Amino acid sequence: SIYPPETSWEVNKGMNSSRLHKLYSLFFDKSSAFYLGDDVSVLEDKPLTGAYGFQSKKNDQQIFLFRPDSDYVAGYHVDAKSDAGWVNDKLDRRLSEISEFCSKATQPATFILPFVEMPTDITKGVQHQVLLTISYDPKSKQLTPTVYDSIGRDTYSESLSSYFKGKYRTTCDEILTQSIEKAIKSTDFTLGKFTRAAYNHQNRLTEGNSGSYTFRTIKEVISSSAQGTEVKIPGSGYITSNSYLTSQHVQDIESCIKYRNLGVVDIESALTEGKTLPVQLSEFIVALEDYGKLRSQQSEIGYSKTAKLTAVELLIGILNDIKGKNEISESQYDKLVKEVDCLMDSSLGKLVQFHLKNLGAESLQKLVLPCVKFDD
């Protein structure tokens, strides 16, 4: 399976398990604002199926980060006459696997699992991205569950009176606490206080960018567990959301999803042996081809559509020729210079600009010139 470059994506347009996995590649990119190799290093294994293991350099603690899964879903019923909802069987099945790992765990661990919360009895379909953290201390013996939420509170001109919270739920906390209680019913562990940390002042049905917030919280919870520090979030350690999810964070995310072409084997490698994934030139070709496909489609000033499909076609041909063995005709290089202005216009430009920066060239000509064979 492959995580394509989705050239038109932006953070307000939502998350899914595949792209949240793709963003995991930035955890060992020293160039990225999400870099963790300072804070932790890879572990072996220590087999927690479906999770990546990490050992902190600074202290004793073990961090397990679960790979996103489209079945990590909890549904809650807004109507409080109904039952609290459902937790999908797979999410339940790794509350049980965490608890069995902890039953033999001998060093303290934190478990990080990104999942999706949704209201089922409301006709409207809304998905909301949240983060489950379970930390276990081998001497308590406590699992403390926490949910990080990027859309809740400051409540007031629009809260529920403690009457109406008896009538309506806004959260899967009731059924998720039940799931965790049932998962440790087997064991001897005492269950710590279930808390939900709601940050980023107030948002709508929109997640719509909470995928990006919970990815960011993932990096914050690994960093803070490695250094033995409280987790800091908006409204509790960070001034406002833009302190937390800064503009550099947003673009590290947007460039990863928009412009790279990663196979899941590459990401698994990247976090099972703690290494960066250098951008290769084939990705550039693929990114162009899917900017081409998606720009054929619409809108059916500026450069015409036929102008930029003729642009990217010729530039893909060049990059293919450049790729193997092979080298590029001088006749074809003149065609490209008269297309260079079109390649760098309007988002297609940011695509070209991204790859040029990640393959070490100042421009198209400087990228392709060492490659040209003049006659003669």
Swiss-Prot record:
GO terms for molecular function: cysteine-type peptidase activity; phosphatidylinositol-3-phosphate binding. Changing residue 149 to A: Abolished ability to cleave lipid-conjugated ATG8 family proteins. Residues 1-277 are annotated as: Catalytic region. It is found in: Secreted; Host cytoplasmic vesicle membrane. GO terms for cellular component: extracellular region; host cell cytoplasmic vesicle membrane; host intracellular membrane-bounded organelle; membrane. Keywords: Host cytoplasmic vesicle, Host membrane, Hydrolase, Membrane, Protease, Secreted, Thiol protease, Virulence. It catalyses: [protein]-C-terminal L-amino acid-glycyl-phosphatidylethanolamide + H2O = a 1,2-diacyl-sn-glycero-3-phosphoethanolamine-N-glycine + [protein]-C-terminal <stereo>L-</stereo>amino acid; [protein]-C-terminal L-amino acid-glycyl-phosphatidylserine + H2O = 1,2-diacyl-sn-glycero-3-phospho-L-serine-N-glycine + [protein]-C-terminal <stereo>L-</stereo>amino acid. Its EC number is 3.4.22.-. GO terms for biological process: protein delipidation; proteolysis; symbiont-mediated suppression of host autophagy. Residues 278-376 are annotated as: Membrane targeting region. The active site is at 128, 149, 210. It is an enzyme of class 3 (hydrolase). The keyword Chloroplast does not apply. It comes from the Bacteria. Residues 163-169 are annotated as: Alpha-3 helix. The LIR motifs (LC3-interacting regions) are required for the interaction with ATG8 family proteins. The LIR motifs 1 and 2 at the N-terminus bind one ATG8 protein and the LIR motif 3 at the C-terminus binds another ATG8 protein. Among ATG8 proteins, the LIR motif 3 has preference for host GABARAP (GABARAP GABARAPL1, GABARAPL2) compared to LC3 (MAP1LC3A, MAP1LC3B, MAP1LC3C). The membrane targeting (MT) region binds phosphatidylinositol 3-monophosphate (PI3P). The MT region, together with the alpha-3 helix promote localization to high-curvature membranes, intimating localization to highly curved domains in autophagosome intermediate membranes. The alpha-3 helix is involved in extraction of the phosphatidylethanolamine (PE) moiety and docking of the acyl chains into the lipid-binding site. Cysteine protease effector that inhibits host cell autophagy by targeting lipid-conjugated ATG8 family proteins on pre-autophagosomal structures. Specifically hydrolyzes the amide bond between the C-terminal glycine residue and an adjacent aromatic residue in ATG8 proteins conjugated to phosphatidylethanolamine (PE), producing an ATG8 protein that cannot be reconjugated by host ATG7 and ATG3. Mechanistically, Ravz interacts with ATG8 proteins conjugated to PE via its LIR motifs, extracts them from the membrane of autophagosomes and integrates the PE part into its own lipid-binding site. This is Cysteine protease RavZ. It comes from Legionella pneumophila subsp. pneumophila (strain Philadelphia 1 / ATCC 33152 / DSM 7513). The chain holds residues 49 to 430 of 502 of the full protein.
